[PDB]
Write a protein that binds this ligand. Structure first.
Ligand SMILES: CCCCCCCC/C=C\CCCCCCCC(=O)O[C@H](COC(=O)CCCCCCCCCCCCCCC)COP(=O)([O-])OCC[N+](C)(C)C
Ligand SMILES: CCCCCCCC/C=C\CCCCCCCC(=O)O[C@H](COC(=O)CCCCCCCCCCCCCCC)COP(=O)([O-])OCC[N+](C)(C)C
Ligand SMILES: CCCCCCCC/C=C\CCCCCCCC(=O)O[C@H](COC(=O)CCCCCCCCCCCCCCC)COP(=O)([O-])OCC[N+](C)(C)C
Ligand SMILES: CCCCCCCC/C=C\CCCCCCCC(=O)O[C@H](COC(=O)CCCCCCCCCCCCCCC)COP(=O)([O-])OCC[N+](C)(C)C
Ligand SMILES: CCCCCCCC/C=C\CCCCCCCC(=O)O[C@H](COC(=O)CCCCCCCCCCCCCCC)COP(=O)([O-])OCC[N+](C)(C)C
Ligand SMILES: CCCCCCCC/C=C\CCCCCCCC(=O)O[C@H](COC(=O)CCCCCCCCCCCCCCC)COP(=O)([O-])OCC[N+](C)(C)C
Ligand SMILES: CCCCCCCC/C=C\CCCCCCCC(=O)O[C@H](COC(=O)CCCCCCCCCCCCCCC)COP(=O)([O-])OCC[N+](C)(C)C
Ligand SMILES: C[C@@]1(F)[C@H](O)[C@@H](CO)O[C@H]1n1ccc(=O)[nH]c1=O
Ligand SMILES: C[C@@]1(F)[C@H](O)[C@@H](CO)O[C@H]1n1ccc(=O)[nH]c1=O
Ligand SMILES: C[C@@]1(F)[C@H](O)[C@@H](CO)O[C@H]1n1ccc(=O)[nH]c1=O
Ligand code: NA
Ligand code: NA
Ligand code: NA
Lengths: 533, 533, 533
């Protein structure tokens, strides 16, 4: 096989040029398709052109930043030195301008909107103050991350809620997801037949979870998830001044669950501080995963609000963690180590899809079994309470009544009016004790009742609430913070870092509370910007 | 934070008094509720008052026994010395009185009831004699546990079957369970829809198993299960003279499965004797779990009889184990070590509920798959036997016919009349080979046919049997002794105690046989007391 | 217990004779039943007599071969020496006779049948040549196994397709399986109710997989599977000259999956060569399992063709593996070590049934989830392609069109006519990317459309194809070679042999390609013998 040996030698000699030429040819073919499509019709081919343009821009930008990093840093250094020189007097001016802007915004927008928005602002202040009072180290507090996180949340809310561009962008993004979750119906129909709608939840909702997990694993294989995670983490790190590890984990928990997000930085867990570990757990508790998003949307919960809350939950999580448990040590991990994220052991895209599909079995199984047990326990508890309540001629006693009269202040501070606060408190209880699959399920019923348009009150019982309250509840409930999740979180984090078991158990409860508080802060910011119809 | 430090110091200084005061306040509130309810109406608040009274009595009793144990023992010692002094001649008197009582009971009750009850007594004697003949060490037999276990079974049967108080108590207890298993319908309806009754077994029965496992895990977390287990084990230990480990395991297997019951004494397994290990396996094989109770009740099997059999199966298991495999070594474990039972790694009640729910996935999955395979094999076997039977112009040959003509003597000795013995033998075969989920399922069909009231015989084929036979079959079938369970039992017990693998394999078959024999003994005792309608 | 000791001593003294006498009595009883059945009626009892006769013949043959092996070998040796002496000139005569026979068969059968059969022969030649060109070691090729495997495939095809005896035998064998898979309906009906047909796939097809896995585990416990495996492996080893390990694995993969077949030789995996490992993987990729056979038959795929393809896939796998990756080392394992296969840890038949049933849970779960994900991805891909295709006024672009225009040459070489090649290419794509559960599912639709008898063309779209194309597709698609299976195969084989991880990853892709090529070779041989209706 002399010819075969010569061919192998030729391939070895110019391996780099051959593959580069092949990739260039593929790129040229794609560009030819795009340009031909634009030529035949432009209005019809606009989205493809836009996608290609943005991809090209990002590729060029990344290449330039990687290549000319040192030159750009050197060019920026003089301005940084001048700003540091004049900061001792410029800080007061900047702070005064920001405070004046806050005051003007309040006076000219929030007061016009009404009283409930001012109550939302007051609730924000009150939650922050309460977190400060019960802090682990109240004296050793670094206030930069707190203010920066709250400001980032406010800016995101302004751009997405009070501007036509962001509103349109996020509505479109939500609509695309709603279309995307409809593809699982093919597999559900084949496996479970054309009668798969006889059992809506089991045979139509869970397949959405399966499909979303598959797609997420495929995206992780390709590397887009890590790209977006790094882009967001750099912003949060530069503005807020947090450590790279916690910033990366917070940015990744927007898309990934609390248990699987620490895997982004597996090797460096034994060397993190207590504060970073607490921030990791808090970020896990203050966000949801992309797999369960489709189920919540199927129930009827707004997609745009869910995405907005997931985005806003990260700065709030980091700020609340830093205030609740500030840093009193020296971090060891550096930016390059944190940003590098080890992709999985998948040889090709289809293997990644299979791996993602297989992992979803336990998820759906546990979801179903826990729902069964929780609802059975709820029924038993309500029956027992009615039995006890009949002694005092009050057989209407129930879990819902107690929770409505208990969690009312937390909902009132978020800006919910007096009447609907008692209804939001029930959802808060459902989430606090059982989980968020139940709270969103009841919220969907309330939304459907409003959409139907029946009587708001029947026999003096409120049947549904307003749009603003529904949005505020959507923001408040977006989290994984329940008493049950504490054990599984601790177990997983110990399994990843056996040596840090003593530290993990110490901060888990504070992390859970901080996650709940962060959800409430996001809800308050939402409420102070939405208007009363 | 000087104020915070002062508050922390104050909390540390008087930590004990603060929590004690809080608990006292909670207790006072509960008592205030109880007394107010009684004041408003007494007949309506009676059960709450009774529950509170019994709880108070048991708490006070436990405190007194723990505090004044030494004084009570010293006070009792003189009487024990006197009894030991006079025992050498008093033993004959006591034994003669007991024998005379047995004879009088036989003559004046059993003969009046009829012949079948005398046959039941004879079957009891015969099973005991057969266990003696095939004993591992016939010469080294300690007869105290045998007689004491049989006597405890007889006393329990008298109190629960032949007295209005016990009959009413256990009927009420059974009715409460039937009400309790109806709460799972809420979760089943949500997860599987309002059409969940289209698939009765899968979508209504298994959720009962899930809910019961959840409740059992919660009770184990609270500590009531261990309380009852210790109370029963002390009685069995004092009366029968067995070792603490086997007594505890037998008392715990009333509520817990054979695989999970040894976990009550995990550390001490390597140090147990062969006899104690055999007793453990026998107790596992002679009882059922509380999770599968609801399914059997849903089929239509009597709850009171199931509870009575589960209670009676422990003394029989221990007696049959001691007779089959008596003790020839010195036990090492002591009472304090055995009674202490390590609760699980659950931080709160809801985490315990989640853990219990998750563990139930494998249980129901295996139940369903094994049922599918066993019924398919049964159909294939029956078709093949009919094919073989057609050669001799007898195409009616089947598994049921062979089992009816094979297991008939075992059912006849239990007191089942001649006609119904052939029908009970089929259930015995179903249980011996496949499992008890099948035997109870067929028994439920027979019971339903009787309740309908159709012809007892159609074309010379008996369609149903009497009430007494159904009760005797309920007692006989209450066990986990099947040829399949041998492997899983051995695997689990080796996984708990790897070093004792050689001993575990040796006694497993004898334990299985002893469990079957114990079930039959319970059935014989039931039969000799029930009357022929 | 002196009598017991005497009985035990007597049993120990003559243990061998007692059990032998018992087995002889059982055999005599069985023979008495057989003879009585024949006496009462012979035509009715014929199959039982035939089964008994063949069993007796095989038992006697095995005993004689085991006992008189040395004498038979010595008797055969002289002829072997004479043949070796005259081989140097007799080889040319034998080869010329074989070539002349091939030429005559072509001229007088294949040409008469038509052009497509000649195209099938040419495709066979072309696939072999392509495997030779891209071989790992083209110079170091041992041609005996290649020709012998192709010849064995041709002989099997002649006996099973072009002779009434083999045709009848395999049709009968297929019909028995179709009857056998109907027994699972009992378990499916009980567990999932009389409405289990509302969800055909989930509640009727997967139980077939469960039941077949149970039966396979039972057969492995009994030892028939190993008997047949050894019988086939000896033939393949003697004729082809392959190593015992790869021959055994290839013979066992007819009935067993790719992951579980290497367990037949677990200990010797670390000591195999690279070529044997490659052959193992190739055999795994070129065959199916007996558990999934029932599902394919339920869809509507021919049973006889499936069995024939499974039988023919082993010689092709070995030949293609030897040509693609020939042997350049010295094998270490010997025949006695390879043939001995360690049965599982099952004490009795029912325990084996339970073990087989439990293992089937993961199989069906993964099947269902992967199907859901794959079909959802297919729908999304088709929608996206239609969106892209509308730019050029061609909204009909799809995965199916691309695959039809891509895989067409591979189907044309197999002998499929011009029109149906584009349809077979779609099935090839479905199998190559997703899996064979999808390709057979679509093939069943095509077969059903033909059976209905509607218009072959509607609006210029072909709705179904011919019988010959359906058979060729049945042969082509019988394999587990998909891009997804690469990862699971590698993981399992590394878990069995951790030390050989470097070698396993190297040959997996070549093994996958070789499996596909072997399937195509079987299809070509099928096509060159079937006639055009
Ligand atoms: C409208 C809705 C949301 C709007 C969000 C807008 C948020 C922007 C609001 C305000 C921006 C201006 C804040 C400047 C405060 C100084 C922070 C600082 O670094 O010094 C710290 C004093 O830190 C303090 O104790 C000050 C706390 C009270 C300040 C309230 C104003 C001490 O030094 P440090 O520990 O090194 O830090
Ligand atoms: C418009 C509607 C109403 C108003 C909304 C306002 C929304 C404002 C949203 C976000 C701005 C929040 C700024 C919080 C500053 C914290 C103070 C601190 O110590 O960090 C300082 C950073 O240096 C700065 O001062 C950052 C200035 C950012 C200016 C953004 C425009 C110094 O950092 P350090 O040396 O590490 O200590
Ligand atoms: C509910 C959400 C309420 C959010 C709204 C408001 C909460 C405001 C902050 C107060 C949080 C408690 C401070 C704290 O760290 O204690 C922790 C809670 O300790 C507990 O076990 C109580 C949990 C219930 C907390 C509800 C109040 C114990 O700290 P650790 O033992 O060091 O760990
Ligand atoms: C009505 C339905 C059920 C009623 C149950 C009522 C059960 C109460 C029935 C009978 C209570 C009286 C039994 C007393 C028997 C002596 C046992 C003893 O300890 O000595 C043993 C003799 O053990 C024997 O060999 C005696 C066996 C035959 C006795 C049959 C009576 C030898 O000493 P040990 O080994 O140290 O013991
Ligand atoms: C009423 C209807 C019909 C009759 C039913 C009767 C139901 C009776 C039910 C239970 C009583 C069964 C007693 C069995 C005694 C076994 C003999 C033995 O060796 O143990 C002895 C215990 O010492 C005793 O004798 C125990 C006496 C208990 C008296 C209960 C009243 C000595 O123990 P040891 O020194 O360790 O040897
Ligand atoms: C009808 C459908 C299917 C029919 C299948 C029928 C198959 C029977 C067809 C043909 C049987 C005759 C084949 C004899 C070829 C010699 C093989 C041999 O051992 O020597 C090798 C030459 O090997 C070669 O290079 C020869 C390759 C070309 C031969 C084509 C004929 C070299 O020695 P080796 O490496 O030690 O080997
Ligand atoms: C009938 C319809 C049309 C024709 C179909 C023909 C179907 C033929 C099907 C199978 C026969 C295929 C024979 C392939 C022989 C390979 C050549 C080789 O080197 O091995 C040789 C074996 O020695 C042989 O030659 C084997 C002879 C077998 C004769 C079978 C009748 C020598 O082995 P080595 O010393 O190890 O080197
Ligand atoms: C965290 C949860 F307990 C949730 O509370 C429950 C309700 O969604 O499901 C669990 N869950 C969900 C998604 C995920 O990715 N990981 C995970 O553990
Ligand atoms: C022991 C069993 F094989 C039973 O025979 C079968 C039928 O109930 O289910 C198994 N089983 C049931 C309850 C339990 O707690 N543990 C357990 O293993
Ligand atoms: C190999 C497979 F990926 C198949 O491609 C898929 C479609 O049948 O199921 C998997 N499978 C099937 C049978 C078996 O025995 N083992 C196994 O892994
Ligand atoms: Na998350
Ligand atoms: Na038990
Ligand atoms: Na196979």
């Amino acid at each position: 096989e002399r010819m075969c040996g010569r061919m192998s030698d030729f391939c070895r000699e110019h391996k780099t040029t051959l593959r580069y030429i092949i990739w260039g040819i593929l790129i040229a073919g794609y560009l030819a398709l795009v340009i031909a499509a634009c030529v035949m019709n432009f209005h019809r081919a606009l989205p493809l052109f836009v996608i290609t343009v943005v991809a090209i821009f990002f590729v060029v930008w990344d290449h330039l930043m990687a290549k000319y990093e040192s030159q750009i840093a050197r060019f920026l250094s003089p301005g940084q030195r001048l700003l540091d020189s004049h900061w001792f007097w410029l800080k007061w001016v900047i702070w005064g301008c920001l405070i004046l802007g806050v005051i003007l915004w309040l006076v000219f927008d929030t007061a016009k909107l009404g009283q409930q928005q001012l109550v939302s602002f007051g609730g924000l202040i009150i939650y922050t103050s309460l977190t400060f009072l019960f802090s682990k180290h109240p004296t050793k507090v670094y206030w930069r991350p707190v203010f920066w996180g709250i400001g980032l949340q406010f800016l995101l809310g302004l751009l997405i809620l009070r501007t036509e561009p962001g509103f349109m962008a996020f509505d479109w993004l939500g609509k695309q997801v709603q279309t995307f979750l409809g593809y699982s119906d093919a597999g559900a129909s084949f496996v479970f037949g054309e009668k798969y709608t006889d059992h809506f939840f089991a045979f139509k909702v869970l397949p959405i979870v399966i499909f979303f997990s598959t797609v997420m694993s495929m995206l992780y294989y390709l590397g887009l998830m890590q790209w977006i995670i790094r882009k967001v983490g750099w912003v949060m790190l530069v503005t807020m001044g947090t450590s790279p590890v916690e910033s990366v984990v917070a940015s990744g928990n927007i898309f990934i669950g609390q248990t699987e997000s620490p895997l982004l930085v597996r090797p460096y867990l034994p060397y993190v501080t207590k504060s970073e570990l607490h921030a990791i757990m808090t970020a896990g508790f203050s966000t949801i995963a992309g797999s369960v998003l489709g189920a919540y949307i199927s129930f009827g919960v707004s997609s745009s609000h869910l995405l907005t809350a997931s985005v806003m939950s990260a700065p709030a999580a980091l700020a609340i963690s830093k205030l609740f448990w500030p840093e009193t040590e020296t971090p060891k991990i550096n930016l390059k180590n944190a940003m590098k994220m080890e992709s999985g052991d998948s040889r090709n895209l289809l293997e990644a899809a299979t791996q993602g599909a297989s992992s979803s079995i336990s998820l759906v199984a546990n979801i179903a079994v826990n729902l069964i047990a929780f609802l059975a326990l709820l029924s038993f508890m309500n029956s027992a309470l009615s039995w006890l309540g009949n002694m005092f001629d009050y057989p209407q006693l129930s879990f819902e009544v107690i929770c409505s009269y208990v969690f009312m202040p937390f909902a009132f501070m978020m800006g919910v009016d007096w009447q609907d606060s008692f209804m939001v408190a029930k959802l808060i209880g459902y989430k606090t004790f059982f989980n968020e699959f139940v709270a969103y399920q009841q919220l969907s019923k309330l939304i459907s009742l409003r959409q139907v348009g029946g009587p708001k009150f029947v026999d003096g019982v409120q049947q549904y609430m307003s749009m603003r309250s529904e949005a505020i509840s959507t923001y408040a409930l977006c989290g994984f913070a329940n008493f049950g999740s504490l054990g599984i979180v601790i177990g997983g984090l110990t399994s990843m870092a056996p040596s840090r078991k003593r530290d993990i158990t110490a901060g888990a409860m504070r992390a859970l509370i901080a996650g709940t508080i962060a959800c409430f802060l996001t809800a308050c910011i939402a409420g102070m910007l939405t208007n009363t119809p």
